[PDB]
Design an enzyme around this catalytic site. Structure first.
Site, short mmCIF file in Angstrom:
data_model
loop_
_atom_site.label_atom_id
_atom_site.label_comp_id
_atom_site.label_asym_id
_atom_site.label_seq_id
_atom_site.Cartn_x
_atom_site.Cartn_y
_atom_site.Cartn_z
N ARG A 176 0.84 -1.19 0.00
CA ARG A 176 0.00 0.00 0.00
C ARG A 176 0.88 1.25 0.00
O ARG A 176 1.79 1.40 0.83
CB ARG A 176 -0.90 0.01 1.22
N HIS A 177 0.58 2.19 -0.89
CA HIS A 177 1.39 3.39 -0.96
C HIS A 177 1.33 4.21 0.31
O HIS A 177 0.35 4.14 1.05
CB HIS A 177 0.97 4.24 -2.16
N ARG A 181 -17.10 6.52 5.15
CA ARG A 181 -15.75 6.01 5.30
C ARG A 181 -15.59 4.50 5.51
O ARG A 181 -14.63 3.92 5.00
CB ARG A 181 -15.03 6.72 6.47
N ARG A 233 0.48 7.65 -7.39
CA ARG A 233 1.07 7.34 -6.08
C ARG A 233 1.38 5.86 -5.91
O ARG A 233 2.34 5.49 -5.22
CB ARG A 233 0.19 7.86 -4.94
N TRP A 273 -2.03 15.13 -0.52
CA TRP A 273 -3.40 15.50 -0.18
C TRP A 273 -3.76 14.99 1.20
O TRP A 273 -4.42 15.68 1.97
CB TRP A 273 -4.38 15.00 -1.24
N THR A 296 -8.89 11.72 -1.13
CA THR A 296 -8.31 11.59 -2.47
C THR A 296 -9.16 10.79 -3.46
O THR A 296 -9.51 11.28 -4.53
CB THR A 296 -6.91 10.96 -2.44
N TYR A 319 -14.12 8.31 -3.99
CA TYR A 319 -14.77 9.00 -2.86
C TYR A 319 -15.96 9.90 -3.21
O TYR A 319 -16.51 10.59 -2.35
CB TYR A 319 -13.75 9.81 -2.06
N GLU A 353 -8.07 3.02 -6.03
CA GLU A 353 -8.64 3.30 -4.73
C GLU A 353 -10.14 3.49 -4.95
O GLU A 353 -10.58 3.74 -6.07
CB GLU A 353 -8.04 4.61 -4.19
N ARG A 354 -10.91 3.34 -3.88
CA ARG A 354 -12.35 3.55 -3.92
C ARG A 354 -12.57 4.99 -4.36
O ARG A 354 -11.83 5.88 -3.95
CB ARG A 354 -12.94 3.34 -2.50
N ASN A 394 -8.34 0.68 0.23
CA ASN A 394 -9.60 -0.02 -0.04
C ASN A 394 -9.46 -1.20 -0.99
O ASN A 394 -10.04 -2.27 -0.74
CB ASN A 394 -10.68 0.96 -0.52
N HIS A 428 -4.18 0.52 -3.42
CA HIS A 428 -4.56 1.43 -2.38
C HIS A 428 -5.32 0.74 -1.27
O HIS A 428 -5.82 -0.37 -1.45
CB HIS A 428 -5.38 2.53 -3.04
#
EC number: 5.4.2.11
Lengths: 236, 236, 234, 235
Positions: free
Chosen positions: D7-8, D113, D59, D13, D20, D89, D86-87, D183, D181
């Site tokens: 995971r990064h 979240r 990333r 941000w 993000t 948002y 990533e999920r 998620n 990521h």
């Protein structure tokens, strides 16, 4: 079609006057800065590659990476090929350049170095600087992999990759970036422009400045090639 | 590593005494039967290809298409390449054989057919038997496509496909079946077996009989290549 | 974007009233003739696929082959996916259709057959008609491979392939041909046109007649779909 | 089969308290260090990836780009996919976290979240934080790209990539490293380990520490997943 050439900056072995060849040495601190500079220039001049091609040598891959990060196009599809590698430096691999200049003589030195068709001597399979049997080439026909090379041989192995693989993308409309080496890039340029075999020894591609070629439908310069920093590259 | 070669049978042009080369002539009802026989031999002798390689010529494609149906392995992944295409016969393509044997006396006829180093006359783009600009090759560098070919040339443009592509599946334990043509298959056999330039003109591979090659880690024949119907082949 | 759908002709098991599913049965003699007919039609109507996609079932691959030969575009790049396969027919695989009609009843039959979301019963792993562990699926996640399916489940597994793989080619400008099956093609059509889950049970794609869809930038019909032989289709 | 997840680390941000999701925010100097650490662990513990998988987010890409340089395996083949992103948002993307915690009371904040089944508000195409029409996704079906995502949805669009693509290299003996990521990685861990819908919201994978998974022929964990720096992960 639009194509972009990028010669990686200096190698750690390069900073210490050593012949690198296919040895997997990494980039120097300034080598890394030029990569950023190259990517910086890529963004500045509005040249956005859709695809990336690199050799299997880490010094080139790093350059491509640091450069794309700065260019904001890291998401780009990537392919690597032993065919875009540097010229294999035969028995000369890992040896001091000043010292090789005195072992052999200027004549034989410039031959083992700039002879279009006379490769350095073959490197012994047991030498610590031969990558015969290297992990990154396990899927390639053992027999094609060189134990020494000249720009002549380099071009032979580079062309198919350009003909089938790189060309398909160019012909598809994609802008391609090739992060490679001195001899491998020199070979593509000689071929791309139609430079004699006797003249190729005089052309040197500067490190860290994207060289762009606007090609026509036949994959030939529709206009003359240009560096994204004509000034720095002009220096020579 | 296990490689199985299969040369297509008769086309409707060979059937009518016409040189074919790169013209996309259809397979004759006789060829279609030989392919079913090739598939039958594959199944009967337990030669289970994992991957299929063919040229861009329909007669080779059809052969695999039929051979595989009878071998019950039609699900196998298919990969095609111009690099596996029959030698380009140049100007001789839309030409009656008996006529060119008369037109040209042995000196010219026999050489164009079995000379290893010297090619036939280039066919002009105007001819209705030229492939210059053909759709199936629009994603290949226009400058590489041959207008004539010697076996030498064929072995040359074929080798890099073998070296990078076929070699990978072979080195991955994938039994690979190749459906190509007389010149391309012999050109590959010569490389595998190291046949000399003077001896290759003697070799011929029977149409329709699968040829198995057991290879070692360096892709060299670990034992003599054999036909699945040794008897039918031996009558050559 | 231009896309062409082709439903293979009848299966040898089909001629003898047997439920095929993922069983790798081959084409019937007339099945083979329809393939030629389909390819014939492809040429006649000037529709030239640049790429080919097929399931991993030989009855579909043959069709694509006989069809492309006749169309003169055999040289075309080909990709195959378990995702474009027919609906797995659970325990019903290899069983007589008249006989299954009397084992269960019309109600449960039309459920195990046309229920949008009720798959036949799971087929036992040892049954001679299960392809659990089949060579052509050794590289696929063992767990995703079904042991029964409904059009519902079929669509789930078909969509990703269409979303990533087939779409990239359509979006690249290529004309694509998909040689597949009844349920797999039905599922892509339901999705392609926006047919309700309750209505999908009524649509059937005829075998041997290329169905073309002229799609827009969003991969949706820019004009209504058409068979290359509207007459026979009707 | 051997899978290594990474995971990064921190982006510029997260560093500035911003959600993000799918915005292509750069990795912060701190993230860049965690990646070099990830590469170091890979080398030190002898985890030799043969192939690399990443998302379409820089990333994650940069992380592998640095991790691999330190692992001396930068030649490894690289494969990328939106399915590992990533999920999304949604509307919360260009939003200060502390502000949305105030704007929305726990009921809304905590759910968006860690709710497994219910997603954030869809972000509009007008927003300068929407990806609708982005170049890196022009070859993907426009109708599939999400405007918001729950873990549920993420696990859903990710599974087919895992099943067909990553599964093949895994089943071919290729040790595969994945750079994704929070998620996406947790969403994959849950599938591998069979974590329940109610329990997944509890799990979290430390940023920058490679996670190894020994898998069997059916791609199931043959022994518990372990971190290359167990101690640092345990903290």
């Amino acid at each position: 079609p639009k194509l972009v050439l990028v010669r990686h900056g200096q190698s750690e072995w390069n900073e210490k006057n050593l012949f690198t060849g296919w040895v997997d040495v990494k980039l120097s601190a300034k080598g890394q800065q030029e990569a950023a500079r190259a990517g910086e220039l890529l963004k500045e001049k509005k040249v956005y590659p859709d695809v990336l091609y690199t050799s299997k040598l880490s010094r080139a891959i790093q350059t491509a990476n640091i450069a794309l990060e700065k260019a904001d196009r890291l998401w780009i599809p990537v392919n690597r090929s032993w065919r875009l590698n540097e010229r294999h430096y035969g028995d000369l691999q890992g040896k001091d350049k000043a010292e090789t200049l005195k072992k052999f003589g200027e004549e034989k030195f410039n031959t083992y170095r700039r002879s279009f068709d006379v490769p350095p001597p073959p490197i012994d399979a047991s030498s610590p600087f031969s990558q015969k049997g290297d992990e990154r080439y396990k899927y390639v026909d053992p027999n094609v992999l060189p134990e020494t090379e000249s720009l002549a041989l380099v071009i032979d192995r580079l062309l198919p990759y350009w003909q089938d693989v790189i060309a398909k993308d160019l012909l598809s409309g994609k802008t391609v970036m090739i992060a490679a080496h001195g001899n491998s890039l020199r070979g593509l340029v000689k071929h791309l422009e139609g430079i004699s075999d006797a003249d190729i020894a005089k052309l040197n591609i500067p490190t860290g400045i994207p060289l762009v070629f606007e090609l026509d439908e036949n994959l030939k310069p529709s206009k003359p090639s240009y560096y994204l920093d004509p000034e720095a590259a002009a220096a020579g």
